[PDB]
Design an enzyme around this catalytic site. Structure first.
Site, PDB file in Angstrom:
ATOM      1  N   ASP A 193      49.556  33.056  41.750  1.00 43.64           N
ATOM      2  CA  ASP A 193      49.440  31.926  40.849  1.00 43.64           C
ATOM      3  C   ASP A 193      49.714  32.448  39.451  1.00 43.64           C
ATOM      4  O   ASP A 193      49.978  33.640  39.251  1.00 43.64           O
ATOM      5  CB  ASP A 193      48.077  31.237  40.968  1.00 43.64           C
ATOM      6  N   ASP A 195      47.795  32.054  35.592  1.00 41.16           N
ATOM      7  CA  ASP A 195      46.556  31.655  34.940  1.00 41.16           C
ATOM      8  C   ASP A 195      46.742  31.576  33.433  1.00 41.16           C
ATOM      9  O   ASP A 195      47.237  32.539  32.833  1.00 41.16           O
ATOM     10  CB  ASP A 195      45.447  32.673  35.246  1.00 41.16           C
ATOM     11  N   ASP A 250      46.495  27.843  37.288  1.00 40.66           N
ATOM     12  CA  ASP A 250      45.165  27.553  36.804  1.00 40.66           C
ATOM     13  C   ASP A 250      45.181  27.371  35.295  1.00 40.66           C
ATOM     14  O   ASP A 250      45.703  28.222  34.564  1.00 40.66           O
ATOM     15  CB  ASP A 250      44.186  28.668  37.198  1.00 40.66           C
TER      16      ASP A 250
HETATM   17  N1  8GT Z   1      40.284  35.277  42.916  1.00 35.72           N
HETATM   18  C1  8GT Z   1      39.129  35.303  42.235  1.00 35.72           C
HETATM   19  N2  8GT Z   1      39.142  35.389  40.914  1.00 35.72           N
HETATM   20  C2  8GT Z   1      37.896  35.395  40.391  1.00 35.72           C
HETATM   21  C3  8GT Z   1      36.696  35.330  41.043  1.00 35.72           C
HETATM   22  N3  8GT Z   1      35.647  35.374  40.131  1.00 35.72           N
HETATM   23  C4  8GT Z   1      36.188  35.481  38.948  1.00 35.72           C
HETATM   24  O1  8GT Z   1      35.590  35.548  37.898  1.00 35.72           O
HETATM   25  N4  8GT Z   1      37.551  35.458  39.052  1.00 35.72           N
HETATM   26  C5  8GT Z   1      38.462  35.615  37.940  1.00 35.72           C
HETATM   27  O2  8GT Z   1      39.573  34.843  37.996  1.00 35.72           O
HETATM   28  C6  8GT Z   1      40.683  35.668  37.538  1.00 35.72           C
HETATM   29  C7  8GT Z   1      41.998  35.071  37.897  1.00 35.72           C
HETATM   30  O3  8GT Z   1      41.876  34.912  39.294  1.00 35.72           O
HETATM   31  P1  8GT Z   1      43.117  35.079  40.298  1.00 35.72           P
HETATM   32  O4  8GT Z   1      42.593  34.776  41.687  1.00 35.72           O
HETATM   33  O5  8GT Z   1      44.295  34.229  39.761  1.00 35.72           O
HETATM   34  O6  8GT Z   1      43.503  36.638  40.399  1.00 35.72           O
HETATM   35  P2  8GT Z   1      44.611  37.567  39.772  1.00 35.72           P
HETATM   36  O7  8GT Z   1      45.443  36.775  38.780  1.00 35.72           O
HETATM   37  O8  8GT Z   1      43.865  38.797  39.382  1.00 35.72           O
HETATM   38  O9  8GT Z   1      45.451  37.918  41.099  1.00 35.72           O
HETATM   39  P3  8GT Z   1      46.635  37.099  41.805  1.00 35.72           P
HETATM   40  O10 8GT Z   1      47.723  38.073  41.387  1.00 35.72           O
HETATM   41  O11 8GT Z   1      46.316  37.101  43.285  1.00 35.72           O
HETATM   42  O12 8GT Z   1      46.827  35.748  41.167  1.00 35.72           O
HETATM   43  C8  8GT Z   1      40.466  37.001  38.247  1.00 35.72           C
HETATM   44  O13 8GT Z   1      41.388  37.929  37.645  1.00 35.72           O
HETATM   45  C9  8GT Z   1      38.915  37.123  38.166  1.00 35.72           C
HETATM   46  O14 8GT Z   1      38.406  37.798  37.119  1.00 35.72           O
HETATM   47  C10 8GT Z   1      36.701  35.265  42.441  1.00 35.72           C
HETATM   48  O15 8GT Z   1      35.716  35.204  43.181  1.00 35.72           O
HETATM   49  N5  8GT Z   1      37.982  35.237  42.985  1.00 35.72           N
HETATM   50 MN    MN Z   2      44.041  31.918  39.399  1.00 35.33          MN
HETATM   51 MN    MN Z   3      46.176  34.826  39.143  1.00 39.76          MN
END
Ligand code: 8GT
Ligand code: MN
Ligand code: MN
Ligand code: MN
Ligand code: MN
Ligand code: MN
Ligand code: MN
Ligand code: MN
Ligand code: MN
Ligand code: NA
Length: 326
Positions: A193, A195, A250
């Site tokens: 995704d 963000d 997001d």
């Molecule tokens: N996926 C996920 N993100 C969480 C959680 N709790 C939380 O604070 N977050 C925050 O949400 C942020 C953005 O989430 P994200 O799922 O898009 O993860 P990401 O961008 O690191 O990885 P991605 O490359 O899979 O999109 C994370 O980097 C994390 O700090 C959780 O339980 N799951």
């Molecule tokens: Mn996300």
């Molecule tokens: Mn993400």
DNA sequence: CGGCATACG
DNA sequence: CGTA
DNA sequence: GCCG
């Protein structure tokens, strides 16, 4: 090796991918079975390996490392000796693991929902589509767009999405800003995704912003799915040459007083932030979330102008986003 | 023995 | 519950 | 599963 992941740099590229990936399979499987504590340990152990400066070649190199006990050490021992860990392979090949991974990968489906469907005999995405009454609107959207949502989001997609989000945000509120967060801010080349964190430099002007942004995006035909609100977990219709693809996006709005806390929380990694919040409460007696840092005995919030301020108030050496890949 | 991050939709 |  |  510090015990908390927020006390050590973890780069994006590291030297123990084989070992960490095996431990992360066990962590994922522990989650599928409802053991959040075992999941956390295996995640923490994998993360310790990501922070090491060189490849682990001998079991001796684990001595003294935090979160390595009998079980995680045996996994590494078997991978070093044999190149495979029997337990990891058994889980990998298991119908339960494969199906729970398939179902929980769907937007709108978590472990508890996936487990219920598994217990009902469902096994494939077509099985779910055959029973649409059992699906929320969110799950229907996740299944409808599942093929596109399984395609890695690339930087070219991020840049195009940032432009259209900035355009809508500027139409909704002059002076508002859009900051890329999540894994791309940590230096990832791909993601599941994109963000974005939205604010305005004048406290309070951002009130009511996210509905106005969503309406403007929906009227330009950019929204395939969305849910007063301050977080929107969306699916966008991203134009491509001659066509389009669905992308998860997001959007979060924060007042500028909260912006460093929201930037820190939404930049991740997920384990880094859980570890930072654990550290804050258990070592410093302070309560951290994406809104603020609260001292429960004085009943006050810490005013921060930057992420660096937050690290400093927690007594932690600052880590830039590229070193938060725990 | 029990804790394990913490919130919004 | 789902999401982050 | 590991640890305070
Ligand atoms: N996926 C996920 N993100 C969480 C959680 N709790 C939380 O604070 N977050 C925050 O949400 C942020 C953005 O989430 P994200 O799922 O898009 O993860 P990401 O961008 O690191 O990885 P991605 O490359 O899979 O999109 C994370 O980097 C994390 O700090 C959780 O339980 N799951
Ligand atoms: Mn996300
Ligand atoms: Mn993400
Ligand atoms: Mn290195
Ligand atoms: Mn064991
Ligand atoms: Mn052996
Ligand atoms: Mn809020
Ligand atoms: Mn116990
Ligand atoms: Mn246990
Ligand atoms: Na899911």
């Amino acid at each position: 090796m510090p015990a908390y992941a927020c006390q050590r740099p973890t780069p994006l590229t590291h030297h123990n991918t084989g070992l960490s990936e095996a431990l992360e399979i066990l962590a994922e499987a522990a989650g599928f079975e409802g053991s959040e504590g075992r999941l956390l340990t295996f995640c923490r152990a994998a993360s310790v390996l990501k922070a090491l400066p060189s490849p682990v070649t001998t079991l001796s190199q684990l001595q003294g490392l935090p979160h390595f006990g009998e079980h995680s050490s045996r996994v590494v021992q078997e991978l070093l000796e044999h190149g495979v860990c029997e337990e990891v392979e058994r889980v990998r090949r298991s119908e339960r693991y494969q199906t729970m991974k398939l179902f929980t990968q769907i937007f709108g489906v978590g472990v508890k929902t996936a487990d219920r469907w598994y217990r009902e005999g469902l096994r494939t995405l077509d099985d779910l589509r055959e029973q649409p009454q059992k699906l929320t609107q969110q799950q229907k959207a996740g299944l409808q767009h599942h093929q596109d949502l399984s395609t890695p989001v690339l930087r070219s997609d991020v840049d195009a999405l940032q432009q259209v989000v900035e355009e809508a945000v500027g139409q909704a509120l002059p002076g508002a800003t859009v900051t890329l967060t999540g894994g791309f801010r940590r230096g990832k080349l791909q993601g599941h995704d994109v963000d974005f964190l939205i604010t305005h430099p004048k406290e309070g002007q951002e009130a009511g912003l996210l509905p106005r942004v969503m309406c403007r995006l929906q009227d330009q035909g950019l929204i395939l799915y969305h849910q007063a609100f301050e977080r929107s977990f969306c699916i966008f219709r991203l134009p491509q040459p001659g066509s389009w693809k669905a992308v998860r996006v997001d959007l979060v709005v924060a007042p500028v007083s909260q912006f460093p806390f929201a930037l820190l929380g939404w930049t991740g990694s997920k384990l880094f932030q859980r570890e930072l919040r654990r550290f804050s409460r258990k070592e410093k007696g302070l309560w951290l979330n994406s809104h603020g840092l609260f001292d429960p005995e004085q009943k006050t919030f810490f005013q921060a102008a930057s992420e660096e301020d937050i690290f400093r108030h927690l007594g932690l050496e600052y880590l830039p986003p590229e070193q938060r890949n725990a």
